[PDB]
Design a protein around this ligand. Structure first.
Ligand SMILES: CC(C)CN(C[C@@H](O)[C@H](Cc1ccccc1)NC(=O)O[C@H]1CO[C@H]2OCC[C@H]21)S(=O)(=O)c1ccc([C@@H](C)O)cc1
Lengths: 99, 99
């Protein structure tokens, strides 16, 4: 679809069999989700935001559905204030900015 | 134009008479710019994201040109690692997400 930006671009995502709300975040290189339980193995990693760096759990090759569009990529899980869908997954669903 | 998301959506902007590079960020409600000594009245504010908060100065009715599209609105100035064009200005330049 075409999404205007007078409101937050929030979408329902499907991950690990559970639905969640997440923000389509073109300023995020990576996808970062709030604390949750995901199956499979993970490795500790660091990510930086506007306020500094946080420790996260990196799950690779995770199946995630975004507005019915399927993606398989890295998902970082940690103390983010907001579930954000970053460019690593926005590219998989064919997302672009237009003006 | 159409901006794909393989790389960071960086564009050239003009603010306070200076050219800068900034991120077109659908994940940001408002616009945050690197420290700069803008004239006029401002008020202090704290803004938060991954890693915590930073202190910024809020200027209102600031003119920014974004790839030739003029816009005027609120701008936060402080020690952000990158210039961030948020939805408050993205709407004004007719920017949409499309997939
Ligand atoms: C909800 C999101 C978290 C909000 N944020 C915008 C995101 O798009 C940030 C933008 C950004 C890009 C690069 C360095 C630091 C911050 N991206 C980001 O955290 O992504 C991380 C994951 O992927 C990696 O790549 C990038 C950095 C890593 S915010 O910046 O915290 C922000 C907070 C308050 C306001 C008020 C004024 O409205 C405006 C903006």
């Amino acid at each position: 679809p075409q999404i205007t930006l007078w409101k937050r671009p929030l979408v329902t995502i499907k991950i690990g069999g559970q639905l969640k709300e997440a923000l389509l975040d073109t300023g995020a290189d990576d996808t970062v989700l709030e604390e949750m339980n995901l199956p499979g193995r993970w490795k500790p990693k660091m990510i930086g935001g506007i306020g500094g760096f946080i420790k996260v759990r990196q799950y690779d090759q995770i199946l995630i559905e975004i507005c019915g569009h399927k993606a398989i990529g890295t998902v970082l899980v940690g103390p983010t204030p907001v579930n954000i869908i970053g460019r690593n997954l926005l590219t998989q669903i064919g997302c672009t900015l237009n003006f």
